[PDB]
Amino acid sequence: ATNYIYTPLNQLKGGTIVNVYGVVKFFKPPYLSKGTDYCSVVTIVDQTNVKLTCLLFSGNYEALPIIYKNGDIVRFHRLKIQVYKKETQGITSSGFASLTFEGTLGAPIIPRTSSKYFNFTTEDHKMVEALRVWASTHMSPSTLLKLCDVQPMQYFDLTCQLLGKAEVDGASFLLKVWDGTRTPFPSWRVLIQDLVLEGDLSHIHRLQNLTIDILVYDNHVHVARSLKVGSFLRIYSLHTKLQSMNSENQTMLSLEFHLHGGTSYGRGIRVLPESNSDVDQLKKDLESANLTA
């Protein structure tokens, strides 16, 4: 007989392995740690209003929770509860498995996971719906900022399509992306070498200022280097910076986009599959834009 027991987040105890359900309040998408594994940090909350920060490690990128945005709902199996500096934290245990769901009321309930075999019952449905009901009142909806609405200096998550990639100087790497709308000020343009840029050059040229240049640094470089041109991405905590003085000390205006080193605040990149509803909307904006350009 198989019957999973889920422990409310306020009833957790150190030195135990449990199963839990929660709403994602914060998360760092999978990233290669200094150690052996990819790592994803996820802070979840449930109806008891207690928050639990989970440190999840796996040698396989796909084995970590497939979370696309805050508000997503997760089901974790085999989560070990321990105490770190008098603080209880969750961490992956052997056989750890997760299912992730959209967190908005009335949304399809389609479990996302890399697991080949997984338990999914009517009981799970009720649990997900209950968290969505709870969340609608104790959390904020999800809002997708387009490039035409970005402010001079702010951090934001960008949903876009990758059009080009270019090595720069090793410590940084260029991603040329677009979302179908134009920034309020022209994007800065990183000086690139000739044959270095990979992607449809003529398409990029025709789009003009519809594309923006994003420079990613340090740990973000190997991830950027591996991206497939044409794929859809969510770049978390991208940073805009209005530049009003160039390197030659001339006054001007351009908008810079940086994905700074480190993983604080979720800075990172996750490839969005075409099965993602946000990608469906994006494709239409791209088609509309393409006709004009």
Place this chain on the structure above:
DNA sequence: GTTAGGGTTAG
């Protein structure tokens, strides 16, 4: 086994 242990670079 370690990793990381949320809480913005400073290019």
